[PDB]
DNA sequence: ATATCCCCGCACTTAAGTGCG
DNA sequence: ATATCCCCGCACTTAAGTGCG
């Protein structure tokens, strides 16, 4: 599988005499962005993905593309797919179908489902292990979970282990949240996180949507169906595959949230309260979260030789998952790359000793 | 139901402020290209047909059409569908999964496939009976072939009967079109319905493409998969299901083409010749077929309760297929709405 | 049917030894609100309507009320009923059943439906008349629609007449809208006004909802179901009765919309375009529409002897509907409080 | 399933900022009243039960509860339900009209009515077949009464066989209650005279008001009209449909009263006496009944796969009634789920422990 | 402690919500 | 520049939106 990913302002696609020309849109303070010239006898690209602001596609260039069996997919701002021009005869749909056979296969489904929650538990320990500055009894038990996880028979049995562990995690996380916040519990009387009335749960709920957004962008940038999950069961209006992909990356929003609390960026004027008593975010607060999420997300990580951003790593993993379905990879692992950060400067410790 | 046809060189679709600007291409001698300006939430056009050579459409334009649920189809030189840009697929994946399960089941699949061709045969005759004003041999026997369809054991066997009748159909269809139009049949030098040649064949090729487009829009609209058709054992990424659904509606194209033959609207003035000795509709010709297809598609037919347009009848027929697949409907029949005098 | 309508800040219900004390809320800038004291041996009130924000109720007062067959319904900010404490053995429900029954009877229903549309047509003239400063061809005819109405033997048939008229109304209204605004039509490609793309339509949509609220507040205040209408057919989540009651008072919104246009008060940062290309109001904008509707609604009008505000006219008119439906009144006319300037 | 009971003088419900604050009334000799604080979109309690003499509620508090789907019930000094505060009704009036349309039709109305009493009989039998440890003279009909019920051509005729069996049922039920409690017959509230308030007949009325409250919530939730019952005719503003839906679940109360009696948890300290020589429940008493009703209602029953609680089952049944009316469902039946008699315990603590601990 | 963004009907779909298990 | 306010499944409801007649 080989795709060209196009971002920024000014995505141009035209044909200067049989040679297809592609200008990736710039996002920087107006500099020189990547240019591409394709031969009508060598093009390897199986598809083009456009998560772009502005851009001009010339008619001849769309035609050339179709004639060369290049799919053109246009993503919308939210990572959700806007439209796609699929050429006749394209091994591209193999990916969506491999995914569907796998979902329909008990043995397979389970294995992939397990491969998502396995990672969640690792990243969950990493979060709470990093609570070294909030060391008052933050004790976490991951192998306990993991062992049960290796032996689970059903998909629900997974949710069981996922959940049991989750509850314990939230109790520990809460030890880092000041009393004033009123982080009562992560879930309502119906065991749902939805419709938050407290700040932290509102922060986390908005945080997670931004993560889901990336998962949507990543998935669609890879040729899979967002609606068919392995751990999460498909149902109308449920972006199930995204909900799966979120599980190995939730740690990023949990960190961002904690980072905001840590500083105290959160003010009361950042929130609003619905006629239904829910606590929504005022734009000021909505920004404070996008900005930190983007920062935590644009941190780089050492993986597969290169040092790359977390956002690229989500794409990398879903690309991996996709290949695994095709059999263009015989090993799947959302546990790698791992996460960690040493003591928040020698200052925080040396100053505290007073 | 309106379509917007774009042809010539230098076609443009840009967004100014929030309004969709559409500039038609250059093609006429001194008669200037048509200009269009569409306000947000105020667009009547069902689709867009791009038959033009040069053009430059903006990303925001594609977004503006998609959000306004306006299909953007692109053809090529001959008049066949190259690609279509349709709005995002349904969030209910049970529909697609039902469709697949039915295709998976060898027998279920065989039952659905026959239901398309069953209808195609009924409408093939219906037209030949309307063509009563040109009586020399308009008598069509479906019954003996329709009985052969009732008893076929494979999808390949269905394509065997499909063709047998298809040949006998155009053998009796010729009688309607004058000798001067040089139409023998639709078959190639080997076995194909692709490569232009005959003046009405070029008119038909374009017609079937306009119909294909509505078929995809309707397929999409319900939540089915354009690529997994029951009858057609076509290419992986080929619109097999649209090719399937084409069959019970194909008669609409045939009639629209006829509604120009005795109407004297056609002339050599709108048909450029290929260097390979084939035929291509010029913008002037293409416009006459896009408009005729549009009138013939907007003809009202008394269906269940309401006297509905043939356009809307496609939408309801594919929805029925989708409802049948999900057992929300327990009987499937593409013959149910029939054509009249 | 005698109700106690409470509203404002600091509503109070307490029992000062055997007697019920009701201290109405004060919305006014420290101006004496009404106080009520009832003996247990005499209370004519059938129900209390609390359209309050703040206030206090004691257990003794709630208990006293229930033990004296006095209903207590609390309305939420949007006009919708929040909860009602209905005493057993209370006539009160007779209203809803009369309304439910009148909708059920064919001719009975069409008789009420007609009266709603009759009044609309009249006020529709009253606006276009008032638009005398913008005299160029603002001519509108009611008498053809009024007489066609007299004999429409169907609910659908009523709508047909309402339609033709509204279409000509928005042509004359467009004769008062500056070019700078954009006002293609008042309806979309599916003949609906929902999801506006332009300014005026957005203002109208938002305006009409403020009227919808007003109708709900009144409807619930008089003890009728907001979902069962005579002209508007009940369908899930449709406030059909409010949609009916909106028609004789929509003129107030159209007035607020003209008033706003005249001032030029509407700046660009009052509107916001969505991802689906709809035009919605910013808080800044919404207030301007809210305040204008508020002033136009609070305009006093001499009715049945005492000059009363339009909001109170709405209440009085549903009061009339309730009484008509329950034989407590034989004649009904929504035209009655006519508009003038 | 949780019920917040408030008693005595000086009950208080107010909203500080966004939090609901509850203060219970004064009654305990020296022991301070209970205080509750609820965070927005974080309240687990299903209903409030005000049984307190004095106290006050703010509109913001009333609103807060409505918006958190918390039912607020008020009872008279003798346990009967004065009023309940439910969230607003369904916007699908199709279900209410489907109900009205059934009510209008005689053959239709009768069929529905009969089905309520039909179930009640089967549950009356279960209760009694459970009161089989107290075998002395307990013996019940049901089948003869079920046959009379089939024959009846009027709604009034049903109400006859309802009571004719109820009479026999209560004479039988009396064999489970000790002579000291002084339980004779029932007779609802009808003719409120001397001693028409037996110490346990009293407890039954309370339970029945809590059950009434539940049915009213379930009705409200499935968009039916509480004021249009098939079996019962009653006053215009009477919760006729609640009284109907009460019938197939009345057993839950009977069972709770019986449990409290067999426990002997009930003590003279939980009752004040009336000037017309009647009996009323004190706060301790009310608390006891509310808790044992909650316990009884939270007991599970296997129903269509899932092992669902009775509180849910009531809800499931009203929805089935609602789907039946709108023709969204073909068969109506309150007989299913059936109540089981699988808890026969004595000095058999050795195996009663090994039943749940093994499976 | 602030909101309200159609109103022809039919017969749907979609995306929020929901009351449990 | 402008958004993003869960994510156990089931089996619902509600509110919004839609493709016609
Ligand atoms: Ca159209
Ligand atoms: Ca369309
Ligand atoms: Ca509960
Ligand atoms: Ca409940
Ligand atoms: Ca609306
Ligand atoms: Ca959500």
Numbering used by the authors:
A (entry chain B): 1 to 354
B (entry chain A), C (entry chain D): 1 to 341
D (entry chain C): 1 to 359
In the authors' words:
Phylogenetic analysis of Cas1 proteins suggests that they may have originated from casposons, a novel class of putative DNA transposons in which a Cas1 homolog (the ‘casposase’) functions as the transposase (Krupovic et al., 2014; Koonin and Makarova, 2017). To understand how Cas1 of CRISPR-Cas systems may have evolved from a transposase, we have characterized the biochemical properties of a casposase from Methanosarcina mazei. We have also determined its three-dimensional structure bound to branched DNA that represents the product of casposon end insertion into a specific sequence at the 3'-end of a host tRNA-Leu gene. We show that the casposase is tetrameric when bound to its target site and can site-specifically integrate a range of substrates including casposon ends with 3'-overhangs and even short single-stranded DNA ends as well as ssRNA.
The pseudo two-fold symmetric complex is a clamp-like tetramer in which two casposase dimers hold the double-stranded target site between them, with the 5' termini of the single-stranded casposon ends emerging through a narrow slot in the bottom of the clamp. Each casposase monomer exhibits the fold expected of a Cas1 homolog (Wiedenheft et al., 2009; Figure 5—figure supplements 2 and 3), with a canonical eight-stranded N-terminal domain and a globular catalytic domain that brings conserved active site residues (E162, H232, E247) into close proximity. In the integration product complex, each dimer is functionally and structurally asymmetric with a ‘catalytic’ monomer whose active site contains the scissile phosphate group that links transposon end DNA and the target site, and a ‘noncatalytic’ monomer in which the active site is located on the periphery of the assembly facing away from the DNA. In the tetrameric complex with the integration product DNA, we observe two dimer-to-dimer interactions formed by the convergence of helix α1 (residues 59–67) and a loop (residues 39–44 between β4 and β5) from each noncatalytic monomer with two loops (residues 182–199 and 275–278) from the opposing catalytic monomer. In the casposase complex structure, the total casposase-dsDNA interface buries ~4700 Å2 of solvent-accessible surface but only two specific contacts mediate the interaction with the target DNA: between R191 and G22 (i.e., the base opposite the first C of the 5'-CGCA motif) and between R192 and G20 (the base opposite the second C of the 5'-CGCA motif). The bound target in the integration product complex is almost perfectly straight B-form DNA, unlike the severely bent targets observed in other DNA transpososomes and retroviral intasomes. Although the only base-specific interaction is between the first C of the casposon DNA (C8) and the side chain of K238, several residues interact with the phosphate backbone (H232, R250, Y206, R280, and R287) and there are arrays of stacking interactions.
